[PDB]
Design an enzyme around this catalytic site. Sequence first.
Site: not given
Ligand SMILES: O=P(O)(O)OC[C@H]1O[C@](O)(CO)[C@@H](O)[C@@H]1O
Lengths: 439, 439
Positions: B119, B149, B248, B317
């Site tokens: 940079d 620019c 959620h 998740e």
């Molecule tokens: O990686 P960690 O700390 O276990 O958190 C992830 C976890 O959290 C949750 O979203 C809720 O406990 C689970 O569905 C998931 O396994």
Amino acid sequence: PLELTQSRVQKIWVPVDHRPSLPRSCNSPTVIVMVGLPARGKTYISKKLTRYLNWIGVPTKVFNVGEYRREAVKQYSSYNFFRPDNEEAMKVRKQCALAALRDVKSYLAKEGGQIAVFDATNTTRERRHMILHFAKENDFKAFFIESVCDDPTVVASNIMEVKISSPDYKDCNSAEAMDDFMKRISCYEASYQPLDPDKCDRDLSLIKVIDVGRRFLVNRVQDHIQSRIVYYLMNIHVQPRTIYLCRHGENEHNLQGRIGGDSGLSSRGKKFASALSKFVEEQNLKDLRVWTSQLKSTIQTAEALRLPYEQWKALNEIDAGVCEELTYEEIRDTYPEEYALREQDKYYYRYPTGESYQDLVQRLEPVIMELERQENVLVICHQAVLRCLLAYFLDKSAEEMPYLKCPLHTVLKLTPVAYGCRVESIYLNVESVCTHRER
Amino acid sequence: PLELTQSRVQKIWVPVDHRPSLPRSCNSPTVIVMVGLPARGKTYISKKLTRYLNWIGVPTKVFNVGEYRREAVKQYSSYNFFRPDNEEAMKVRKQCALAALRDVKSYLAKEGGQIAVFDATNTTRERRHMILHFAKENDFKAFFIESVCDDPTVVASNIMEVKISSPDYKDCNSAEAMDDFMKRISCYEASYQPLDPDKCDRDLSLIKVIDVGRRFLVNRVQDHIQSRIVYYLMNIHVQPRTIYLCRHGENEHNLQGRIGGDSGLSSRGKKFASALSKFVEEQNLKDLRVWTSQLKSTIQTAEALRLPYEQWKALNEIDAGVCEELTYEEIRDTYPEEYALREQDKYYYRYPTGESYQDLVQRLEPVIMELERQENVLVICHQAVLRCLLAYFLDKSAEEMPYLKCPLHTVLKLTPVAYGCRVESIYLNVESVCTHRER
Ligand SMILES: O=P(O)(O)OC[C@H]1O[C@](O)(CO)[C@@H](O)[C@@H]1O
Ligand SMILES: Cn1cc(-c2c[nH]c3ccc(Oc4ccc(NC(=O)CN)cc4)cc23)cn1
Ligand SMILES: Cn1cc(-c2c[nH]c3ccc(Oc4ccc(NC(=O)CN)cc4)cc23)cn1
Ligand SMILES: O=P(O)(O)OC[C@H]1O[C@](O)(CO)[C@@H](O)[C@@H]1O
């Protein structure tokens, strides 16, 4: 409140729809404009891009003005048809372009098409202004793809590879067809106005592919799909290479008729792995990249090659969710509703806590992008993964994809030629069970 | 033959390594060269690109020549230091650039770094020829990123936003710092030789970012990483916007202390969903895109907003494999080895038939690319997904990522400002259980 139901096929949570007494039924499409002189790979770009866009789930169609012309004018005689002083043929050619645009409007506004690739020279500002007017009045987006190349070797190669074999040159020999095509290109050179993003075409969304993808001029990329096209064009190449696709050698789950899991090679599977090494050696490839999934059976197969390999989690077999490690008989007896739903809609069907072929496509897109960048590649994968990749290379629909034949102990040799892949099948003479199930 | 073992942490199948009596231990790095006049967003590009590359797992570091100068020369007085006739400061500035390159060599050849972002202005062909020589002699690839620019409004805005607040202008007021910086830019204008991919820089791998990303000149993209950088630069924008991230509302599994699954909102979760709708309404955003996962709890939360939303399977998740729907107590009692392995290496640990935080990053990359393209976005997701996205926006390491605090019923409001995100937390005053577990 917030009452949802899970759709039986795709397993999508939707609001419970309690339709009233009288149930009532209740983003912008894109015109991709090809720009450039003949033998500039516009049809090659059109076809390859359409193949990729359809595979990722964007309904795409090519409208080639030359095909409308072959339909309107029965037999092609010579470059004299393309002369700027040919008043009659100039009227016919315009009518053909307008008829193609009529079909573009019908495709995008009435057939659920998302992208229309307008494959013509579109070398004059006048023609392009007319296409822009057509797009603005129909609320369609316009994205221009211009192919610029001054290399006479590249032009001659394109004429020899795909132009001389055109239905226009059926009664001609290679030398006369090449000579007529050079004269045909010259008919377009005088009125050719390249895209000018500096002054004239400053507000247009465009990509200039310069010298067979050596350089790119990208102007005003408006959205997600244009950005994807640009990334795709920058990753593909026209260098010669071979793609070998195969499944892992037969595994223990294959012998038991069990789906999914992470079982190891059977005695026959190990024999295939040795046979694959001999086959690979006999191919005499300068460099070869070897890709596997993270599942044991593909890694054990690659281990027999004594070559470096890379494991991709994206190459792992379709996830069967709750049905993992079960036989199809056990699936039909424990989950009969699930079994019948899959048989009826194999592409969109999602296994409970599992995947669909539709999910596989999304996962495999980075694999496809990397396969495009590479040269000689051997992909050792799984039945559903292989069907998905093969559907991309062979331009197969979502409906055909879950039923493509991908037998065990068989190498699929893919050679890019003309406007698509030549496919050679090589069975390595090692017995296995059959895992193919017809509709 | 073909004997493999599965690594305990990452669950990768590797050849059984029966090391002999005396065990023996046994691709090219890239220098990214920033090019352009001061106040052209070179440091902005350097920092953002480094943040993205590190998050996707490519070790990247910025070497800013100005910081080497602030270290060598204690206090900054004026633009007079940057004068071309300032023989002494010109020697010092060269020494600083050479000292930064020395650190580039050490980073790439001895510290396991993959990308070094150099940079500086690098406005002269002489300086760039010297950087090329340094790259060729060390077997490093060179990729040039030039920011061009001419807009004086953009230049003045950059000076006001991040230059006047520079440690160089600590004792100066806004007007004198702006005036000194304009004079400082003028010191560079006479010797400035832009990249010329047409003639002089034809064989160089480069991107020219023209008029704050309105246009791009891309020349000779050699590999995967350069292609990714180009795609990233084409997707990011400098338009003002807000990113809202939340989980959620509390679900039934949260109440039971169970991981994974596809449970629905609890009574408190439904209360949060209503509270979120009121919060969203109070934000008074012209347009807002709402993204959810395909899991019920995020969709039910979005349903309360009465806004269109898009479900992404990539936002689902982390997959706990065999540990899905179990409590952490049940995991420790049934799988004690697995429990301890995860506690020791939370980022790289993969659940059996499940995922790691490392897998999440790979899955979330298209989410990040789309978040960059968009403006106002509300992402309703899950604890591990949220930690991953937050680590990208907040420049957190792989080691920190699995431990980031992402409580339930709390909105994380992200505002892009200077060289990174301003983060505001908004708790929506609805009770829930705590799902956070420290190391
Ligand atoms: O990686 P960690 O700390 O276990 O958190 C992830 C976890 O959290 C949750 O979203 C809720 O406990 C689970 O569905 C998931 O396994
Ligand atoms: C096999 N064949 C090539 C041509 C051909 C002749 N002129 C062309 C002009 C353009 C073209 O499309 C592209 C070529 C290269 C790339 N991007 C890259 O390379 C970047 N790494 C994108 C499209 C193909 C051809 C015809 N047949
Ligand atoms: C907030 N801020 C902007 C600047 C800024 C001033 N000149 C610049 C020049 C370049 C730059 O980087 C990029 C800007 C835009 C894009 N791509 C797009 O847009 C494409 N859709 C990529 C990088 C930032 C700045 C400083 N602070
Ligand atoms: O989609 P189909 O026809 O069930 O084939 C995919 C199946 O093939 C296998 O690779 C082998 O039977 C299974 O692991 C997988 O479930």
